[PDB]
């Protein structure tokens, strides 16, 4: 196997983990499992304490005028390490030797999944969003020599067995009737959205534009603010349907990031340090930070002075359990 | 630069039934980003092995792969008749894929320009990406292009910039390679290729390439 491995500015001290994304089920997460070394004595009494924490960020524009930042701490737990085994631990500690130490945290259930929200040219610094770190460090303060930071991911993955099929409609009289369906509840990344429209007109005013939209939902729970809308990606056609006369299509639309590159504040996977990363994925309700949810919104602009009549259907977009971990870099 | 990935057996006795061992060798450090792949003569390379460890989908349980350095090893317990024909080491770690050597198992003016088509079906552009590579008469494979929608980038290689453009049609799901400066080394046999997106397992498919004779 291979296993990842950090070491101390300094260079005394070293920290190896197995993995870097720690799943969450409906069941526990997956415990973070790791060991610490020491290889000299120069710490004569001083200890090695191990930290997990979890961090969110928020700031946007008119507060960054005025001034104002949001930063907050979900989770913090501490270990003293220096002082059950899993197949893994025992096997770094026969490799490494006397020196290794084994440190174990349990990531609670219910908890923010790691999301980041795309960062504009003008700021240079840490992004904001919802992230997780492991922090050992020399101390029996937080010495830069001493402390080594390693970023995991708590990320979940798309469920094996889809839901029923997400269909919708309206009637409004002056009538007029408007349905539409989608062909799966869960969308894969880079795979286009099929969505079967169906309208039937019978007033003698007609319809002169159909518009679909997906449109992306962040609710920031915390420091409670307005969730953020965003339309990810558009399809706007020119079709009438005449008075006593009904009318079917099918639309494709994909969403992606090339195109939406110049919006600020786009939910986006979590990042290590600045590789490229796709749209968010939805969060399985089953907290307490960014909730990403993906809608898609069809649109008949009715008549003249005139109005729209509309249809939201809900799905879902993630991503396969994949065999191997993901690289969190390009591969090429 | 370009990593060189030598294959130090250029060819092998490899009588039926015996356990063969063919080895790769890089001037870097590629971690496990590495690839194995099989051509039979006048066809289309297939993929064998990705990641140095994983055997992909639908290969027998004959072929494994090791790595302990730089050093990569493809081993063939049991040798059968089907198995004859020319193996291949890629690193896919860095932007050039620097294919290596074969392996042998065996018992137009430059004004001129030219366009090839890639018929796709059952992929899209946003989840994959596409690839044109060459491979000369007596060498080893070459990589000329390569596009990903999904972020919106394309590369092109040192020789063929300013002379080399490659698209895709979204709607028809096609690739095109718009030769238009064809210089002494393009004559070859042109492959188009398809990869995953977000992960990087091999060019997993590959195209029927097309023999080109250009430059008088």
């Known amino acids: 196997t291979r296993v990842f491995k950090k070491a101390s500015p300094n260079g005394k001290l070293t920290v190896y983990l197995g993995k870097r994304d720690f799943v969450d089920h409906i069941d526990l997460v997956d415990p973070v499992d790791g060991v610490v070394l020491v290889d000299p004595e120069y710490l004569k009494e001083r200890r090695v304490y191990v930290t997990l924490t979890c961090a969110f960020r928020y700031g946007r524009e008119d507060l960054d005028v005025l001034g104002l930042t949001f930063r907050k701490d979900l989770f913090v737990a501490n270990v003293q390490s220096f002082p059950p085994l899993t197949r893994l631990q025992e096997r770094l500690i026969k490799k490494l030797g006397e020196h290794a130490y084994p440190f174990t945290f349990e990531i609670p259930p219910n908890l923010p999944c790691s999301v980041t929200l795309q960062p504009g040219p003008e700021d240079t610094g840490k992004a904001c969003g919802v992230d997780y770190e492991v922090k050992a460090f020399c101390a029996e303060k937080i010495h830069k020599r001493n402390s080594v930071r390693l970023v995991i991911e708590k990320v979940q993955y798309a469920p094996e067995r889809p839901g029923p099929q997400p269909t919708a409609e309206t009637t409004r009289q002056f009538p007029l009737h408007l349905e539409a369906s989608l062909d799966k509840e869960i969308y894969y990344h880079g795979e286009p959205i099929s969505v079967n429209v169906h309208v039937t007109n019978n007033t003698n005013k007609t319809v002169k534009k159909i518009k679909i939209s997906v449109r992306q939902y962040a609710d920031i729970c915390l420091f409670n603010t307005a969730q953020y809308k965003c339309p990810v990606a558009m399809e706007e056609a020119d079709d009438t349907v005449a008075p006593s006369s009904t009318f079917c299509k099918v639309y494709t639309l994909t969403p992606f990031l090339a195109n939406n590159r110049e919006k600020r504040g786009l939910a986006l996977d979590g990042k290590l340090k600045h590789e490229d990363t796709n749209l968010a994925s939805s969060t399985l309700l089953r907290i307490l930070g960014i909730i990403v949810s993906y809608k898609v919104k069809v649109k008949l602009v009715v008549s003249r002075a005139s109005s729209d009549v509309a249809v939201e259907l809900p799905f879902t977009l993630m991503h396969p359990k994949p065999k191997e971990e993901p690289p969190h870099r390009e591969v090429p | 630069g370009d990593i060189q990935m030598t294959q130090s057996p250029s060819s092998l006795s490899a009588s039926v039934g015996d356990r063969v061992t063919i080895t790769c060798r890089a001037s870097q450090s590629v971690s496990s980003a590495v690839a194995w792949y099989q051509q039979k003569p006048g066809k289309a390379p297939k993929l064998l092995i990705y990641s140095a460890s994983s055997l992909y989908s639908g290969v027998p349980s004959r072929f494994s792969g090791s790595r302990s350095g730089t050093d990569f090893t493809l081993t063939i317990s049991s040798l059968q008749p089907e198995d004859f024909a020319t193996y291949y080491c890629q690193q896919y770690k860095y932007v050039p894929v620097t294919f290596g050597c074969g392996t042998k198992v065996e018992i137009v003016q430059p004004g001129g320009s030219l366009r090839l088509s890639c018929a796709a079906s059952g992929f899209n552009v946003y989840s994959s990406s596409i690839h044109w590579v060459r491979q000369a008469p007596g060498k080893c494979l070459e990589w000329v292009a390569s596009?990903?929608?999904?972020?919106?980038?394309?590369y092109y290689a040192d020789s063929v910039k300013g002379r080399f453009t490659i698209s895709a049609d979204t709607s028809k799901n096609t690739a095109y390679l718009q030769m238009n400066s064809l210089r002494a080394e393009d004559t070859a046999v042109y492959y188009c290729?398809?990869?995953?997106?977000?992960?990087?397992?091999?060019?997993?498919?590959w195209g029927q390439g097309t023999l080109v004779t250009v430059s008088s």
């Open positions: 290729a398809r990869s995953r997106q977000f992960w990087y397992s091999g060019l997993d498919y």
């Open positions: 596009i990903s929608s999904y972020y919106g980038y394309t």
